[PDB]
Amino acid sequence: HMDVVIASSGGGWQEAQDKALWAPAAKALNITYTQDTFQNWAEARAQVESGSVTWDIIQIGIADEPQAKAAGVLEKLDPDIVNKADFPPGSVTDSFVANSNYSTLIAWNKKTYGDNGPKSMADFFDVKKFPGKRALWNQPIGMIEAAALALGTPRDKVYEFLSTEEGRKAAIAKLTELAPSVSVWWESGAQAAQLIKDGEVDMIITWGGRVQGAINDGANFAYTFNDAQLGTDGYAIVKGAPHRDAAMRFLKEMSKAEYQKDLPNSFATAPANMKAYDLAKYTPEKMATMASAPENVAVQYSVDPNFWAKHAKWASEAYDNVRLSR
Numbered sequence: 001h002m003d004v005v006i007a008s009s010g011g012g013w014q015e016a017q018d019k020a021l022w023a024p025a026a027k028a029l030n031i032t033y034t035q036d037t038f039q040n041w042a043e044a045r046a047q048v049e050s051g052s053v054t055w056d057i058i059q060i061g062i063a064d065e066p067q068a069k070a071a072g073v074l075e076k077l078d079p080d081i082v083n084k085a086d087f088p089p090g091s092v093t094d095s096f097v098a099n100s101n102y103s104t105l106i107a108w109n110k111k112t113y114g115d116n117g118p119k120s121m122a123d124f125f126d127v128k129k130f131p132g133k134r135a136l137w138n139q140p141i142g143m144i145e146a147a148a149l150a151l152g153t154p155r156d157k158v159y160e161f162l163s164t165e166e167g168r169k170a171a172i173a174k175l176t177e178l179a180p181s182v183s184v185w186w187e188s189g190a191q192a193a194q195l196i197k198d199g200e201v202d203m204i205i206t207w208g209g210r211v212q213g214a215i216n217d218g219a220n221f222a223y224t225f226n227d228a229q230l231g232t233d234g235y236a237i238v239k240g241a242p243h244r245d246a247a248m249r250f251l252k253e254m255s256k257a258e259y260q261k262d263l264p265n266s267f268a269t270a271p272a273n274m275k276a277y278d279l280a281k282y283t284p285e286k287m288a289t290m291a292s293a294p295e296n297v298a299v300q301y302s303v304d305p306n307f308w309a310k311h312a313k314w315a316s317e318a319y320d321n322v323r324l325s326r
């Protein structure tokens with residue numbers, strides 16, 4: 001009953017955070033914690049709106065942070081909770097603290113296409129050149145943008161294109177056109193990793209760590225950082241969290257470089273605290289799999305939380321229609 005409740009999205013990502021961050025930080029603070037899993041931020045919104053908040057800390061994506069904050073789902077974090085200078089600019093807000101960088105990328109089945117798989121969004125959406133079963137997320141972040149890239153929008157103009165009603169409509173029409181070839185709308189990263197390990201799909205748009213984990217487990221898949229979305233994951237405290245003050249201390253501790261340095265040990269992720277890189281001498285194999293590595297950054301575009309602050313509601317509704325029509 002004294003336990004701080006921490007919730008992430010499960011699988012290898014939750015295990016990495018638990019092993020590297022939660023278990024050692026709790027021990028150092030003499031605190032006890034309970035874990036939970038969720039896939040959609042609207043589940044935290046439901047707890048707040050019902051007046052029955054059970055979660056303390058929620059790991060969320062940076063583009064969900066503006067709509068969660070606007071809806072009164074997040075607590076305002078104590079002022080000097082982290083040294084913002086240790087983190088990438090914008091990765092720390094008044095209600096969110098980054099823990100990692102990751103990518104929403106293309107992976108393909110080598111049994112189906114060999115080395116000649118889809119290497120861009122245009123290729124992924126091309127059913128004639130690449131016939132086969134596609135897998136997309138059942139949520140729109142990284143999916144709406146993948147359709148904009150498939151339409152031939154340059155990476156640096158993704159959100160400029162999506163700031164227009166015309167651009168937004170064309171991206172939805174592009175997802176609708178691909179929907180007949182989508183065999184599964186995956187819900188969790190562990191389910192996406194399982195589809196890869198079983199070869200149940202020919203191509204998938206999912207998170208890099210999940211892909212790499214499946215490949216390490218023996219999946220006959222390949223992937224590319226080309227046209228991938230560079231994302232930021234982090235922590236927020238739920239408005240009216242039962243253990244608000246203990247959660248705040250837990251968050252301050254787990255954000256330190258001494259814990260962050262261990263996050264890539266069992267999972268292909270990139271720690272958000274820059275001091276972690278000075279503390280840990282990562283292997284070249286590990287470096288190459290990190291989303292925030294310079295060679296990988298060059299072929300990606302960053303997620304824009306300002307776009308999602310404005311059009312998340314329209315996107316969620318329009319994307320639901322693409323999926324429910326097939």
Ligand SMILES: O=C(O)CC[C@H](NCC(=O)[C@@H](O)[C@H](O)[C@H](O)CO)C(=O)O
Pocket residue numbers: 009013039040041059060061062064100101102139189207209210232233268269270
């Ligand atoms: O940061 C990482 O390394 C993990 C990347 C990836 N997390 C994606 C992610 O932003 C969401 O699961 C997010 O937490 C929810 O949609 C709620 O905002 C994963 O589960 O694989």
Ligand SMILES: [Ca+2]
Pocket residue numbers: 009010039187188189190
């Ligand atoms: Ca997940």
Ligand SMILES: [Ca+2]
Pocket residue numbers: 011012013189190193210213
């Ligand atoms: Ca996994």
Ligand SMILES: [Ca+2]
Pocket residue numbers: 302303304305
């Ligand atoms: Ca941006």
